[PDB]
Amino acid sequence: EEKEILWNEAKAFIAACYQELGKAAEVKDRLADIKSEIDLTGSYVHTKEELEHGAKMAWRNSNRCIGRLFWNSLNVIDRRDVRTKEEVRDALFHHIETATNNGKIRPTITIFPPEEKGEKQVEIWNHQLIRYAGYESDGERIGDPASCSLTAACEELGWRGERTDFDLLPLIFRMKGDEQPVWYELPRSLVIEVPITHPDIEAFSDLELKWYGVPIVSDMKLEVGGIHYNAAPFNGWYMGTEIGARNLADEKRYDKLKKVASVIGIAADYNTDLWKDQALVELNKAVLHSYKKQGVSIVDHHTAASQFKRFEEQAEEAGRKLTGDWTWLIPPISPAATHIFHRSYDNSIVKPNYFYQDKPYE
Amino acid sequence: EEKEILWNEAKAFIAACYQELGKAAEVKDRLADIKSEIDLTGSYVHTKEELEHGAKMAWRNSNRCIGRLFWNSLNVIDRRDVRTKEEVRDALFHHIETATNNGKIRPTITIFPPEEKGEKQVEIWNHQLIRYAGYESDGERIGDPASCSLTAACEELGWRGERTDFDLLPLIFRMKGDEQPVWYELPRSLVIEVPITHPDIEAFSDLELKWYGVPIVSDMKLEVGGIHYNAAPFNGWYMGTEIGARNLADEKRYDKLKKVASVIGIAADYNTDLWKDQALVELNKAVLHSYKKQGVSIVDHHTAASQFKRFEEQAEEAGRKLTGDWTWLIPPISPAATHIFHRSYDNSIVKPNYFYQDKPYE
Numbered sequence: 001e002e003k004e005i006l007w008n009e010a011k012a013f014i015a016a017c018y019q020e021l022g023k024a025a026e027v028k029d030r031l032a033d034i035k036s037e038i039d040l041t042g043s044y045v046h047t048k049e050e051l052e053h054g055a056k057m058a059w060r061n062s063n064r065c066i067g068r069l070f071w072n073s074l075n076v077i078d079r080r081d082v083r084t085k086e087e088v089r090d091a092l093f094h095h096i097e098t099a100t101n102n103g104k105i106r107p108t109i110t111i112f113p114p115e116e117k118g119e120k121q122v123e124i125w126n127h128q129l130i131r132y133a134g135y136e137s138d139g140e141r142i143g144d145p146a147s148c149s150l151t152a153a154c155e156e157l158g159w160r161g162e163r164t165d166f167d168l169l170p171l172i173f174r175m176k177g178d179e180q181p182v183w184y185e186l187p188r189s190l191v192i193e194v195p196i197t198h199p200d201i202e203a204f205s206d207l208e209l210k211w212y213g214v215p216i217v218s219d220m221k222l223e224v225g226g227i228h229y230n231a232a233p234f235n236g237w238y239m240g241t242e243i244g245a246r247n248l249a250d251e252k253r254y255d256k257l258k259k260v261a262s263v264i265g266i267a268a269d270y271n272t273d274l275w276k277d278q279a280l281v282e283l284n285k286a287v288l289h290s291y292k293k294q295g296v297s298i299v300d301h302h303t304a305a306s307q308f309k310r311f312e313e314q315a316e317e318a319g320r321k322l323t324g325d326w327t328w329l330i331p332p333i334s335p336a337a338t339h340i341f342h343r344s345y346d347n348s349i350v351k352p353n354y355f356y357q358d359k360p361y362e
Numbered sequence: 363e364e365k366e367i368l369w370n371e372a373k374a375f376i377a378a379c380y381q382e383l384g385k386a387a388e389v390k391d392r393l394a395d396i397k398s399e400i401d402l403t404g405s406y407v408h409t410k411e412e413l414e415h416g417a418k419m420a421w422r423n424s425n426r427c428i429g430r431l432f433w434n435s436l437n438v439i440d441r442r443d444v445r446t447k448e449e450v451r452d453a454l455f456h457h458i459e460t461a462t463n464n465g466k467i468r469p470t471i472t473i474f475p476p477e478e479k480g481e482k483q484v485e486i487w488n489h490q491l492i493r494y495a496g497y498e499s500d501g502e503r504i505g506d507p508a509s510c511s512l513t514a515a516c517e518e519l520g521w522r523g524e525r526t527d528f529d530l531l532p533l534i535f536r537m538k539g540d541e542q543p544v545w546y547e548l549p550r551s552l553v554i555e556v557p558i559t560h561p562d563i564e565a566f567s568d569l570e571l572k573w574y575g576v577p578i579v580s581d582m583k584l585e586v587g588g589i590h591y592n593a594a595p596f597n598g599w600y601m602g603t604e605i606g607a608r609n610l611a612d613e614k615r616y617d618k619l620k621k622v623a624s625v626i627g628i629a630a631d632y633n634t635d636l637w638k639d640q641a642l643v644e645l646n647k648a649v650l651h652s653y654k655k656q657g658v659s660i661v662d663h664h665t666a667a668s669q670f671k672r673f674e675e676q677a678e679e680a681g682r683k684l685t686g687d688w689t690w691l692i693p694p695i696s697p698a699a700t701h702i703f704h705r706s707y708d709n710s711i712v713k714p715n716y717f718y719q720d721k722p723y724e
């Protein structure tokens with residue numbers, strides 16, 4: 001029935017994996033046992049080596065990611081042994097700690113048990129492990145509007161946020177068998193935050209802006225060789241523009257450009273003054289400066305693009321087809337200043353890969 | 363043979379044209395005669411009304427153009443009567459004058475005789491009627507590199523440029539029957555140029571930057587109802603970013619960002635300083651300021667995007683499908699600050715339209 005599609009994707013993944021690993025002769029025998037195990041059990045189990053390389057291939061294949069140069073040094077943590085919510089919680093806690101690494105961020109992924117019959121063993125509700133709540137009630141807007149629905153779902157479960165603009169959401173996830181997810185408050189000792197100051201303009205601190213150190217995406221599905229790891233949070237370090245040009249700048253997010261314009265001392269009255277553009281630049285300089293000053297890893301969009309160029313060169317020379325999403329790879333500020341803007345990319349989907357999946361709330 | 367495809371496109375265009383013009387009942391009779399005229403002659407001739415509306419529909423359908431809100435007030439000049447190179451030259455001269463309009467730019471198109479049997483009556487070599495030459499010889503780079511090949515072709519024809527960074531190319535075009543194009547120097551009295559100064563930073567004039575007032579694209583084909591107007595130059599006013607973010611900024615164009623960084627007094631040493639982004643913003647403020655100060659029409663990318671939003675609303679309410687090229691509609695600076703960035707567009711080709719065509723040089 002579905003062993004068909006499972007077997008096909010297994011054949012493709014194992015062949016490619018073992019080839020890249022220099023283990024091409026072990027394929028037919030490895031494929032043999034797998035083909036067998038699928039018949040009796042309806043599935044198969046990745047070795048640690050396969051799972052680790054699959055996770056790395058998935059990152060390499062993420063069309064929208066500019067950071068892909070470092071795909072091969074991803075730190076893979078195999079947590080397929082977890083059975084309890086305490087183990088899940090502690091695995092998420094450790095991921096935060098080890099990835100943060102006192103500010104010298106380690107690109108890391110923690111992999112939980114995969115879907116069995118399409119049945120989730122663990123269902124993580126958070127978009128990112130560290131993320132700020134958002135509230136909207138009777139005209140009143142607080143925090144991160146992108147978090148409004150998860151925040152409301154959290155508050156249905158007994159949690160209550162302090163309603164600052166930067167409430168840390170609890171971890172929230174559901175175990176197979178349980179009807180409701182559980183939630184656990186984040187130990188603040190584990191969460192590095194960076195207050196936003198500007199190198200030249202002292203008044204910038206009057207904005208009282210901050211962001212969290214480590215983006216840890218926890219709601220995408222890792223697909224490896226027909227196996228569906230629906231719960232597999234992964235992190236890197238930020239590209240400054242994600243914070244300065246979007247999270248803090250978008251009208252539907254924190255919407256800070258008018259306030260930025262004010263503290264840097266320019267008028268926000270005329271489009272021709274390009275006050276939004278100027279504000280975007282100073283806000284983005286502030287973000288890079290602040291992360292650097294605090295000893296927290298971050299990359300600017302120019303360096304990131306230069307790295308991606310090397311990713312392109314590396315692919316070609318390894319004889320691998322390159323795929324990418326131009327509309328996502330271009331940075332939201334000065335895009336024509338990067339080589340990305342001036343070439344095209346094939347947006348084909350190659351597996352292994354990370355995929356969106358339906359949210360349990362909403 | 364090809365009367366087939368000609369008749370099909372005629373049927374589609376006339377129906378749509380006459381409908382939009384409120385002349386739906388005149389269609390079948392108009393279509394009748396056209397169907398007849400195609401049989402005897404192999405072609406058909408647009409009335410002035412049809413040609414004018416077709417040109418406007420072509421602009422409305424240009425997926426890559428952010429300026430489309432004003433499609434319906436395009437000024438159409440019908441020059442299908444020209445027979446001689448003197449008439450062509452004088453028609454091009456007049457187009458420049460009337461479109462410029464002392465700085466209050468009028469979006470205008472001059473339409474020359476269409477292709478007959480696929481045979482061009484008039485073949486315009488210029489990319490734009492007003493454009494700067496470019497030279498590259500023995501390491502030495504002068505002027506606009508995008509113009510290198512046309513400039514070389516011009517210099518094969520007896521013309522010689524002064525080799526400043528802003529040599530105005532002559533008009534160059536070929537008449538049916540002639541083996542070589544002719545060229546005519548531009549009367550400087552007709553060409554408005556704008557020196558680039560900055561509102562706040564006096565040193566900016568040390569760069570001695572300038573650009574021409576009016577972009578007049580002269581190498582695209584207007585297609586209307588199966589008729590191919592290969593020679594039909596059209597102009598609007600500039601969006602500032604075309605000049606400040608591309609023509610003056612691209613490494614393969616005038617490459618001025620390092621010099622901009624210097625005169626505005628910032629270092630150009632570290633990517634994390636975002637010095638390119640800052641330079642782009644000040645250069646783009648300078649361009650808008652300078653055009654405004656001189657009384658020459660121009661639009662900033664924010665106003666232009668707001669206008670385009672109205673173009674979208676106007677389309678919907680008129681029951682017309684909207685088409686666009688997202689990768690071209692987004693401006694090359696602060697794109698995420700415009701609504702364009704945050705929605706998608708169907709990039710389907712609708713006719714009438716303007717099309718690239720093969721260059722006669724090169």
Ligand code: HEM
Pocket residue numbers: 055059062064065066067068070074107108109220234235236237238239242299304354
């Ligand atoms: C090491 C530093 C990294 C940087 C600077 C980086 C940069 C980025 C950026 C800027 C985006 C766009 C996000 C957005 O605009 O919403 C992105 C998307 C993405 N990145 Fe990376 N990334 C990094 C590491 C990683 C890692 C470790 C993985 C997984 C193993 C990964 C997989 C992805 C995926 C799947 C997306 C697409 C998310 C979506 O479509 O919503 N990246 N990356």
Ligand code: HEM
Pocket residue numbers: 417421424426427428429430432436469470471582596597598599600601604661666716
């Ligand atoms: C009125 C002011 C106008 C503005 C501000 C404007 C703006 C623009 C801009 C910024 C581009 C992108 C060019 C590039 O990046 O290389 C563009 C492309 C285009 N515009 Fe407009 N435009 C205007 C008027 C017109 C008119 C009058 C027509 C024709 C009747 C036209 C047809 C087009 C076409 C065909 C393109 C695509 C050129 C290509 O693909 O290379 N536009 N427009």
Ligand SMILES: Cc1cc(N)nc(-c2ccc(CNCCc3cccc(F)c3)cc2)c1
Pocket residue numbers: 146215217234235236237238239242
């Ligand atoms: C590993 C990693 C590093 C880094 N610097 N950034 C990320 C990251 C950031 C944001 C996102 C989220 N992208 C958008 C998801 C989305 C898509 C559609 C609608 C929405 F509201 C939200 C994914 C990955 C991931």
Ligand SMILES: Cc1cc(N)nc(-c2ccc(CNCCc3cccc(F)c3)cc2)c1
Pocket residue numbers: 508577579596597598599600601604
């Ligand atoms: C009417 C009008 C107004 C305005 N503001 N801009 C233009 C305009 C500007 C530039 C262009 C040229 N676009 C790129 C053509 C091209 C395409 C591919 C390769 C190349 F080297 C050049 C076309 C229209 C046209």
Ligand SMILES: C[C@H](O)[C@H](O)[C@H]1CNc2nc(N)[nH]c(=O)c2N1
Pocket residue numbers: 327328329330703704705706
């Ligand atoms: C409509 C458009 O495709 C969409 O809003 C995209 C555009 N490019 C993007 N690129 C990145 N990196 N992140 C985004 O959220 C978006 N938004």
Ligand SMILES: C[C@H](O)[C@H](O)[C@H]1CNc2nc(N)[nH]c(=O)c2N1
Pocket residue numbers: 341342343344689690691692
């Ligand atoms: C590769 C890419 O499609 C191409 O270089 C485009 C990108 N978007 C653009 N958009 C505009 N307006 N003008 C351009 O020249 C380009 N270049």
Ligand SMILES: [Cl-]
Pocket residue numbers: 215242247
């Ligand atoms: Cl984020």
Ligand SMILES: [Cl-]
Pocket residue numbers: 577604609
């Ligand atoms: Cl131009």
